[PDB]
Amino acid sequence: FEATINKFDKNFSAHLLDLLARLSIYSGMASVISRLDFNGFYTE
Amino acid sequence: REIITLQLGQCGNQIGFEFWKQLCAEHGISPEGIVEEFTDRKDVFFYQYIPRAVLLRVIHSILNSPYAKLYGNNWASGFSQGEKIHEDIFDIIDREADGSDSLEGFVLCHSIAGTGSGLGSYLLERLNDRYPKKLVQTYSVFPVQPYNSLLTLKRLTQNADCVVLDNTALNRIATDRLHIQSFSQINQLVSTIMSASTTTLRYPGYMNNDLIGLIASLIPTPRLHFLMTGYTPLTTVLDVMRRLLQPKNVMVSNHCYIAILNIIQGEVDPTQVHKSLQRIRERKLANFIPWGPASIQVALSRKSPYLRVSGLMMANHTSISSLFERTCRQYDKLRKREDNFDEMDTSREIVQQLIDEYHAATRPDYIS
Amino acid sequence: REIITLQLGQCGNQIGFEFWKQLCAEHGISPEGIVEEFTDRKDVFFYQYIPRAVLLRVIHSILNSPYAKLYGNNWASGFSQGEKIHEDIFDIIDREADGSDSLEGFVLCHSIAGGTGSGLGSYLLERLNDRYPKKLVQTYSVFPVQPYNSLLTLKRLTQNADCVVLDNTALNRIATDRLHIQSFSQINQLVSTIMSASTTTLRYPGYMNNDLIGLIASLIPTPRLHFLMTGYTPLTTVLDVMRRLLQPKNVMVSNHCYIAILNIIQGEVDPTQVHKSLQRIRERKLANFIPWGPASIQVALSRKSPYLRVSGLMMANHTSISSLFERTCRQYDKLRKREDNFDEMDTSREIVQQLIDEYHAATRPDYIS
Amino acid sequence: KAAVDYFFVELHLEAHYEALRHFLLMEDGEFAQSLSDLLFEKLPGELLNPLVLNSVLSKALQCSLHGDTPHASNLSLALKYLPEVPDVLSCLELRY
């Protein structure tokens, strides 16, 4: 248990950086990033 | 789901009675508990109509009012007397909880300043022990006074699962824009916030249809469970959203937010809401925690037809720690000025943990 | 970028009041701070309407005015009172500062004629440079023991305020001549007019000069030579306006040459002739500029308030402003010989005499080095 | 005479001209002073994907205080060259 919680973090955070990646390449669909992030987080 | 409200002490009964008076008018319910002729969900608070209230001298003022058809000063004395009537008052709640369809919570209206301070701390311990799956939201009100103020703070930091309203910010707003110079005049302002706090549980909305929806959104960690209120109109959504972030309206006497909830009770345009949030991000009127991703939430609502644009703000601000130091500092000054007296320092110990918990929450490495 | 104003003393609160009346008249804003039915960006001065005013006796009559819904005699004593309420007053500034989106400057309306605000003005500028080092400050000071309080505040204004002088003497000359008054609320009618048109390019968007740094950065060449004068002719083509501005009968001031001029035209005039008027002013040689660097005159257009005719404002940095100081400091030496350490009055007299040297050196063809 | 009149009083030809000037020729302040001010804050692979330059415009129009009309749309802030790396050139178009 103590060793699998950290696995989900590396697994779930990897998919989220994929969602924020594709949701950025667009011409709404651009204001979603301002709904996912507010603090400048996920800036990588 | 249902919610049973408990009113303790003189402060509880009055601000509770003014809470029911405002709500009974919002709905089409006459003071004699009969529906008037003249879509709003009223089953959560009213039982098919009768309010789900448990009142605990001031009672006679309520029984003589036209609303009769609707139903010491030491903290140790308040805690002791509750121990003696444990089975008596717990017999009216048990039937109130059982008789209910599917209980959800236990709203508590009290002030931490004499019997409601103690008897309030007593019920808060028994409630969690009797039911661990029932949320306990407490509308506490801040003012031997320093002692009783922090003693309940010890109970409110581990028992209560979730709103402070301090009389100092109530007095300042009263003299500023209301010109009162009176208890019966400040109560008109708090009850306006309470009836607006649960405006997303009396009308079927898209989101926040349960009491656990309003709580789990703001509170990130079970220790940081103190929230403050903001209410501007005493026009576009940008005007309201900007006036709420003014410290002249926040009812609280580095520092940053953890999560904000905005309640718009008007007929405003539903597409301009995203436009206002965009300009908020540019001008940078609010700063948040650096560690976790925090956002701001805004929800619309519909005013009762039987009973203009308003707005309320629910936020979890780290500046609330300042209020605790004021209570904490005054205690130590009294501890050097005067069976075992060991219950106090234990309370003094646990409240200091929360204060350090807050000051460590505003650091980029709050985790561990 | 939002702008905020501060009014001190008896004078600043008076002209700032009429400044709020005339400005509130430009937009469709009722006296009760409510928009009536009846383009113009009203967000730089007003905050949703609420004006960003900070007022520091007459205040009672101000609230007694129909615009209530719109919100000693020594220098050291005026400086002492500012220290006794250091933190108490400053909270208003901070809560209005970050509550605003992006602060751009600080408009200061105050008098230096021996008032408690005159000292009160000296204190605020010291702290404004202490707390906010990235915030411009502009001040519309007004000129008249009076020599004392006047020369002292000049010591602070020459190193804190990064940028408009108005002497009551040259104003009253305009009063008797073209209004025939022979009062305080009479001359300020024109004073409020100068400030109102001074921000014509800010409240109405244009191409050039869309911010307070857009106007000041061109005129003031060095952080020392930072003094300006104003002109306002309408009291008809472009060649009529600029020619009536350069006359010493209109300037609001009591060798010598200009450094930079700015002329703001508010009318709907035909913009095809604005270059022609520039040619006739050059050829007749009606004004003289510096010899060392290429100094020119600039003009920009804007539109009047449609709710309320060709108006015009002239803003200039003339080295003749040095004479006004010489009138003041000369009185000081005479009062120095006629009457805990009295050392601050020394460095004050010292630093201004450096400024009077800095002006007289700018008029020479070898001002560099 | 009925053809030209049909353009002005029905399709607002007089508006389009006095609107494209507000955006292309940068006549309306607080817009160029907000668009150019944003782009110049950055300065390669960045500042070139449609996630920043196709979105900086939708952030610019909000700070315009003039626009946000059916005319205000259709401002494709596209590019026409891929820069590799002190000069005074930054090629970028703006088509109505």
UniProtKB/Swiss-Prot annotation, chain A:
Disease as annotated in the protein's UniProt record: Cortical dysplasia, complex, with other brain malformations 15: An autosomal recessive disorder characterized by global developmental delay, variably impaired intellectual development, speech delay, facial dysmorphism, microcephaly, and varying degrees of cortical malformations including pachygyria, thin corpus callosum and subcortical band heterotopia. Most patients have generalized seizures.
Function: Component of the gamma-tubulin ring complex (gTuRC) which mediates microtubule nucleation. The gTuRC regulates the minus-end nucleation of alpha-beta tubulin heterodimers that grow into microtubule protafilaments, a critical step in centrosome duplication and spindle formation. Plays a role in neuronal migration.
Compartments where found: Cytoplasm, Cytoskeleton, Microtubule organizing center, Centrosome
Protein name: Gamma-tubulin complex component 2
Shown segment, full-protein numbering: 818 to 867 of 902
Tissue specificity of this protein: Ubiquitously expressed.
Quaternary organization: Component of the gamma-tubulin ring complex (gTuRC) consisting of TUBGCP2, TUBGCP3, TUBGCP4, TUBGCP5 and TUBGCP6 and gamma-tubulin TUBG1 or TUBG2. TUBGCP2, TUBGCP3, TUBGCP4, TUBGCP5 and TUBGCP6 assemble in a 5:5:2:1:1 stoichiometry; each is associated with a gamma-tubulin, thereby arranging 14 gamma-tubulins in a helical manner. Gamma-tubulin at the first position is blocked by TUBGCP3 at the last position, allowing 13 protafilaments to grow into a microtubule.
Family: Belongs to the TUBGCP family.
Ranges annotated as spanning the membrane: none
UniProt lineage: Eukaryota, Metazoa, Chordata, Craniata, Vertebrata
Curated annotation (Swiss-Prot), chain B:
MF-aspect GO terms: GTP binding; identical protein binding; microtubule nucleator activity; structural constituent of cytoskeleton
Residues recorded as bearing Phosphoserine in the entry: S102
Stretches of the chain forming a coiled coil according to its record: none
Record bears the keyword Transit peptide: no
Location of this chain's protein in the cell: Cytoplasm, Cytoskeleton, Microtubule organizing center, Centrosome; Cytoplasm, Cytoskeleton, Spindle
Post-translational note: Phosphorylation at Ser-102 by BRSK1 regulates centrosome duplication, possibly by mediating relocation of gamma-tubulin and its associated proteins from the cytoplasm to the centrosome.
Keyword Cytoplasm assigned: yes
Residues annotated as binding GTP: A113, G114, T115, G116, S117, G118
GO process terms (BP): cytoplasmic microtubule organization; meiotic spindle organization; microtubule cytoskeleton organization; microtubule nucleation; mitotic cell cycle; mitotic sister chromatid segregation; mitotic spindle organization
Pfam family membership, one: Tubulin
Broad class of where this protein is predominantly found: cytoplasm
Keywords: Cytoplasm, Cytoskeleton, Disease variant, GTP-binding, Lissencephaly, Microtubule, Nucleotide-binding, Phosphoprotein
Cellular component annotations (GO), alphabetically ordered: apical part of cell; cell leading edge; centriole; centrosome; ciliary basal body; condensed nuclear chromosome; cytoplasm; cytoplasmic microtubule
Subunit structure and binding partners: Component of the gamma-tubulin ring complex (gTuRC) consisting of TUBGCP2, TUBGCP3, TUBGCP4, TUBGCP5 and TUBGCP6 and gamma-tubulin TUBG1 or TUBG2. TUBGCP2, TUBGCP3, TUBGCP4, TUBGCP5 and TUBGCP6 assemble in a 5:5:2:1:1 stoichiometry; each is associated with a gamma-tubulin, thereby arranging 14 gamma-tubulins in a helical manner. Gamma-tubulin at the first position is blocked by TUBGCP3 at the last position, allowing 13 protafilaments to grow into a microtubule.
Record family assignment: Belongs to the tubulin family.
Name used for this protein in its record: Tubulin gamma-1 chain
Organism: Homo sapiens (Human)
UniProtKB/Swiss-Prot annotation, chain C:
Chief location: cytoplasm
Pfam families: Tubulin (PF00091), Tubulin_C (PF03953)
Keywords in alphabetical order: Cytoplasm, Cytoskeleton, Disease variant, GTP-binding, Lissencephaly, Microtubule, Nucleotide-binding, Phosphoprotein
Entries under CDD domains matching the protein: gamma_tubulin
UniProt-listed SMART domains: Tubulin, Tubulin_C
Cellular component annotations (GO), alphabetically ordered: apical part of cell; cell leading edge; centriole; centrosome; ciliary basal body; condensed nuclear chromosome; cytoplasm; cytoplasmic microtubule
Binding site for GTP: A113, G114, G115, T116, G117, S118, G119
Posttranslational modification: Phosphorylation at Ser-102 by BRSK1 regulates centrosome duplication, possibly by mediating relocation of gamma-tubulin and its associated proteins from the cytoplasm to the centrosome.
Subcellular location: Cytoplasm, Cytoskeleton, Microtubule organizing center, Centrosome; Cytoplasm, Cytoskeleton, Spindle
GO molecular function: GTP binding; identical protein binding; microtubule nucleator activity; structural constituent of cytoskeleton
Result when mutating L324P: In CDCBM4; the chaperonin-dependent folding and hence the yield of monomeric gamma-tubulin is compromised
Family matches, as PROSITE patterns: TUBULIN (PS00227)
UniProt GO BP: cytoplasmic microtubule organization; meiotic spindle organization; microtubule cytoskeleton organization; microtubule nucleation; mitotic cell cycle; mitotic sister chromatid segregation; mitotic spindle organization
Modified positions (Phosphoserine) in chain numbering: S102
Entry's disease: Cortical dysplasia, complex, with other brain malformations 4: A disorder of aberrant neuronal migration and disturbed axonal guidance. Clinical features include early-onset seizures, microcephaly, spastic tetraplegia, and various malformations of cortical development, such as agyria, posterior or frontal pachygyria, thick cortex, and subcortical band heterotopia and thin corpus callosum in some patients.
Family: Belongs to the tubulin family.
Stated name of the protein: Tubulin gamma-1 chain
Organism: Homo sapiens
Lineage: Eukaryota, Metazoa, Chordata, Craniata, Vertebrata
